[PDB]
Amino acid sequence: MVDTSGVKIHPAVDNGIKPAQPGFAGGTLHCKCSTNPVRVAVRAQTAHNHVCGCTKCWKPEGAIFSQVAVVGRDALEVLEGAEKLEIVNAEAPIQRHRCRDCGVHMYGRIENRDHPFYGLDFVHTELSDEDGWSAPEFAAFVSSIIESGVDPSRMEAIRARLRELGLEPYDALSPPLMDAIATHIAKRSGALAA
Amino acid sequence: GHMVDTSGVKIHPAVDNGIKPAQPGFAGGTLHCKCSTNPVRVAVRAQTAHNHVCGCTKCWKPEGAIFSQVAVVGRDALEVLEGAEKLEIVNAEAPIQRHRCRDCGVHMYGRIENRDHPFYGLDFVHTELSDEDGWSAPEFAAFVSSIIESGVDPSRMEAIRARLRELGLEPYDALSPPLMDAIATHIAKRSGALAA
Ligand SMILES: N[C@H](CCC(=O)N[C@@H](CS)C(=O)NCC(=O)O)C(=O)O
Ligand SMILES: N[C@H](CCC(=O)N[C@@H](CS)C(=O)NCC(=O)O)C(=O)O
Numbered sequence: 001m002v003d004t005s006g007v008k009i010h011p012a013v014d015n016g017i018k019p020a021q022p023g024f025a026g027g028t029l030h031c032k033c034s035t036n037p038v039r040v041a042v043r044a045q046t047a048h049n050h051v052c053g054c055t056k057c058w059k060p061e062g063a064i065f066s067q068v069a070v071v072g073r074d075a076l077e078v079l080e081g082a083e084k085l086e087i088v089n090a091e092a093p094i095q096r097h098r099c100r101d102c103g104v105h106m107y108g109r110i111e112n113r114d115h116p117f118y119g120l121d122f123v124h125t126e127l128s129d130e131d132g133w134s135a136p137e138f139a140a141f142v143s144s145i146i147e148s149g150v151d152p153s154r155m156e157a158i159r160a161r162l163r164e165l166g167l168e169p170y171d172a173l174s175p176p177l178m179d180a181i182a183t184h185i186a187k188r189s190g191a192l193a194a
Numbered sequence: 195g196h197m198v199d200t201s202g203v204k205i206h207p208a209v210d211n212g213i214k215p216a217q218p219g220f221a222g223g224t225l226h227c228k229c230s231t232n233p234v235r236v237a238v239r240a241q242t243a244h245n246h247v248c249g250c251t252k253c254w255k256p257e258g259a260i261f262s263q264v265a266v267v268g269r270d271a272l273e274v275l276e277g278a279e280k281l282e283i284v285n286a287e288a289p290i291q292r293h294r295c296r297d298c299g300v301h302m303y304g305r306i307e308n309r310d311h312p313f314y315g316l317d318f319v320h321t322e323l324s325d326e327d328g329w330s331a332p333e334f335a336a337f338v339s340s341i342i343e344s345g346v347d348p349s350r351m352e353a354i355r356a357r358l359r360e361l362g363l364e365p366y367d368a369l370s371p372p373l374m375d376a377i378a379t380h381i382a383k384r385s386g387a388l389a390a
């Protein structure tokens with residue numbers, strides 16, 4: 001039906017998704033600085049890796065989408081260059097810590113103890129030299145790519161391309177993640193017990 | 195002859211036992227609230243568009259229903275006929291001011307007052323409150339995950355989405371991809387990230 005040639009999503013996925021390695025126990029993320037790079041240790045496997053069309057999250061030069069996962073925050077330690085980091089928006093509910101110099105995002109942190117994703121940092125695992133991280137799993141916030149310059153007419157093709165990558169397009173997060181969010185809201189508000 | 199057990203799953207009474215089609219040249223009708231005497235009455239003098247079932251916590255739902263059924267109409271086609279003093283706005287700070295009957299609780303239209311909002315010009319109405327058949331029929335389900343926020347148990351979700359699909363109402367945890375892409379375009383052009 002619809003032609004997918006020359007449709008690019010993110011470098012990490014344009015040639016097929018790379019599988020997790022069983023028993024992988026993490027690695028090191030480095031910023032794109034030639035000198036004094038920010039180095040972050042992620043000493044666990046990640047989960048919920050996906051491409052993301054949201055406007056707020058870091059993408060490499062060119063890519064229409066972002067690639068991002070989640071790790072337990074107590075498995076995160078900034079090793080070298082901690083003083084070169086700054087928050088992009090100190091008011092966004094997820095707080096993105098970013099290299100002052102090459103502008104690459106090193107983690108996103110949830111400071112607010114009642115937020116659904118508290119205890120979980122957002123990490124771009126492509127920032128790591130090692131393979132074996134949690135495979136990308138879907139596409140999040142597909143339609144918000146329009147909000148960063150993507151022409152509406154190009155979407156039929158991009159949704160088809162992600163589907164053929166086995167990366168199911170959603171205009172929010174995926175169903176299991178959207179339901180966990182809603183359950184947590186419901187338990188806090190009293191709509192559900194516990 | 196089925197993978198998911200869908201027995202006993204109710205969605206909304208307007209889709210549970212038959213969905214009524216639109217009819218040709220349907221030009222509108224009257225909505226009324228549930229008060230036994232002197233009910234709010236409102237004219238909707240066009241056919242509606244983008245009818246759907248919705249899980250959002252803020253949408254009116256008949257007693258017992260887990261989903262709302264809500265559609266869209268040009269505001270210039272909408273007029274309050276009777277009971278204007280019985281109506282109140284739920285939350286004047288919401289993007290959509292829901293006007294509602296204070297004695298029966300039924301929402302009679304939802305209006306957008308910000309001129310910059312992507313659905314400015316369009317009122318939201320529950321055409322189940324009409325006694326006439328012929329309105330646009332539901333096309334999809336929106337804010338499906340939201341039903342948990344109104345206390346549906348999360349283990350009920352697999353059977354609820356399968357029942358959606360059997361009815362032809364594809365489930366989305368936001369709105370349909372077309373409507374989602376329209377909102378983003380409206381936003382992109384106002385920020386100037388797209389040419390006007
Ligand atoms: N439409 C999105 C906003 C939707 C949204 O709530 N963003 C998600 C993913 S970026 C979020 O969890 N918020 C991040 C934040 O604001 O901290 C955009 O491009 O601005
Ligand atoms: N978790 C949902 C999210 C709220 C939401 O996304 N609202 C949607 C659907 S009701 C909207 O278009 N807002 C209308 C409004 O501003 O009242 C809820 O049930 O409250």
Ligand SMILES: [Zn+2]
Pocket residue numbers: 031032033037038099100101102103104
């Ligand atoms: Zn740097």
Ligand SMILES: [Zn+2]
Pocket residue numbers: 227228229233234295296297298299300
């Ligand atoms: Zn009433």
